[PDB]
Curated annotation (Swiss-Prot), chain A:
This is DNA replication licensing factor MCM2. It is found in: Nucleus. The chain holds residues 194 to 290 of 868 of the full protein. Transmembrane segments: none annotated. Component of the MCM2-7 complex. The complex forms a toroidal hexameric ring with the proposed subunit order MCM2-MCM6-MCM4-MCM7-MCM3-MCM5; loaded onto DNA, forms a head-head double hexamer. Acts as a component of the MCM2-7 complex (MCM complex) which is the putative replicative helicase essential for 'once per cell cycle' DNA replication initiation and elongation in eukaryotic cells. The active ATPase sites in the MCM2-7 ring are formed through the interaction surfaces of two neighboring subunits such that a critical structure of a conserved arginine finger motif is provided in trans relative to the ATP-binding site of the Walker A box of the adjacent subunit. Present with 1690 molecules/cell in log phase SD medium. Early fractionation of eukaryotic MCM proteins yielded a variety of dimeric, trimeric and tetrameric complexes with unclear biological significance. Specifically a MCM467 subcomplex is shown to have in vitro helicase activity which is inhibited by the MCM2 subunit. The MCM2-7 hexamer is the proposed physiological active complex.
From Swiss-Prot, chain B:
Present with 1730 molecules/cell in log phase SD medium. Keywords: Cell cycle, DNA replication, Nucleus, Phosphoprotein. This is Cell division control protein 45. It holds the Pfam family CDC45. GO terms for molecular function: chromatin binding; DNA replication origin binding; single-stranded DNA binding. Required for initiation of chromosomal DNA replication. Acts at the origin of replication. Also has a role in minichromosome maintenance. The keyword Cell membrane does not apply. One of its GO terms (biological process) is mitotic DNA replication preinitiation complex assembly. Coiled coil: none annotated. It is found in: Nucleus. It comes from Saccharomyces cerevisiae (strain ATCC 204508 / S288c) (Baker's yeast). Belongs to the CDC45 family. The gene is CDC45.
Amino acid sequence: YSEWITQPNVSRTIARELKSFLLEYTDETGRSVYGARIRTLGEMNSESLEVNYRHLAESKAILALFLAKCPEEMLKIFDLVAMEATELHYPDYARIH
Amino acid sequence: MYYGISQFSEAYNKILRNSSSHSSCQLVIFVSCLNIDALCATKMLSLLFKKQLVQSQIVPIFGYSELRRHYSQLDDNINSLLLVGFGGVIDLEAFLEIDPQEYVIDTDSGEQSFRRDIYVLDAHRPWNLDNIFGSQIIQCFDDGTVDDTLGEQKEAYYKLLELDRKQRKKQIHEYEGVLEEYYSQGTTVVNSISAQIYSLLSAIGETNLSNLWLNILGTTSLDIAYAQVYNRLYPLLQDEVKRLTPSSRNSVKTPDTLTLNIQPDYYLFLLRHSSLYDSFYYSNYVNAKLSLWNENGKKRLHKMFARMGIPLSTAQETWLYMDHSIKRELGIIFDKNLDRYGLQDIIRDGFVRTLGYRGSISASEFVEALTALLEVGNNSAQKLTNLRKRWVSNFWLSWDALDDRKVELLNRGIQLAQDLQRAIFNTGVAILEKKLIKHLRIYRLCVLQDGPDLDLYRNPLTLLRLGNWLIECCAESEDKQLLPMVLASIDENTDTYLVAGLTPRYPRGLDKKPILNNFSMAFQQITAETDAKVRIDNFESSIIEIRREDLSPFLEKLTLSGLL
């Protein structure tokens, strides 16, 4: 998995999938839960985004698998995806963290 | 009419002729304290009489009861009076108990002269006709109102004064009908008293940057409540700053350079003297657009700073120590972002003074400091009088803070203004959270029964800070009908409520003919009808005091009143 996750075409595909998880996943009630987390992230000027592993096991579950198998490469992508997911909402949040 | 704008030099030369001698003090200026425009007017007018060596006395006055007391005890050698900021709307000849026959001298010839002149420098309307036409001792100054607006009242006044049956019935009730429509107009301020005295300094040829700064300060104090008047006068102030500013540009800063620029002066609370966060949090206008009392409004504020790209930890730095890149980029950050929140109107150009190396103050920030000095700078007849003495004593703190030698007293003021606006806000949220504004169809009622540091709101100005905060808050909400508002606050020691009647106003960017404060009639007419105990003695006659148990009977007859 270490060698798979680091190949450039694979890395790009993983990023887009993780992006699409945060953008398109919605709660049992129908609210965008990761929109509500990103609001709270940028208002608090918090540097840390909580993600629930069950929300990956319930959608795009290969990402939940790679995340358990080799997190040191997977989180290294999902930190950049979370930066871009919050920067869609708060342009220039890069000047804050 | 009485002294039009064309002929202020004649009224001034008449003061010099009558009241200049090296022998004695002969000139008295009565100034309404609790008015910044009357303060800045009287400061200019004292620097003028200093330069002419006219020996003079300035007496600050709280209200009409003290005007009668101080007038009653004037030494008979005093032969000119200036009434700065009051008395245009009362019959001064009746109120002061003048009979001109006890004042007339040298009656010969189609002629009179008098042992005293009473010059009224006042911006309030509707003018009392027995001052403007009906007296030779009282001598009003005008912006132009009388010739432009009063021609039908002039004619009606004289045809009724001459006429001491069909041909009579047909006419006496036409002319009384014109006066009866002229009264039954609400109160308004239509000019700054300082721009009147600056136009007198322009007639004498005395203008300089010190008198121009006092003109800018006096006129800026109107912007909160009479925005329609500030916008008439603002174009005329821009021209005078250009006229008096010296030739040099790309100038080196030196301890001696005063610069009085026209530059961006954002509509924010004490920006240069506070953080960038407190500037938004305590601004009347911002609070009104974001609904910033409740915690979702506070989220909208953080969500804005995050979107502007300013860390909260930077936004909360004191503006001097906040970093050099943000402070020059800020014009671009606001021109990009404020539009999203509708805050676009915060962008404004204003007057900014900097002296030497001591760092800039805007005219907006300086009047916030000067008002905070009037408000908090330091057996019921003793309990009132030892309080009104305090408000006369505070006038000299605001006065001394107009001097450049006394910046430490301005810096007291700039700290006190931030203590007040925090207390206004912490009270204004209590009113909106606890739903204390009751809708009474004809008007909105608010009554502060109890609360933290409630003993501030017994000063008429501090009650008007909270009034102007609750008005901005309502005036921007698109669903509310515009209605007059009554704001009452208890003093637990005197056992009265201080009651203020407030005009609503249009939202701060919309661009109509003015609306007028008719509580000044409704309170008098209900007072005359009732046996209740009240005080109707304040110069801003929208403000009254009433004993605790009489208030509910008073409001009960206010809702019936057709005068609002």
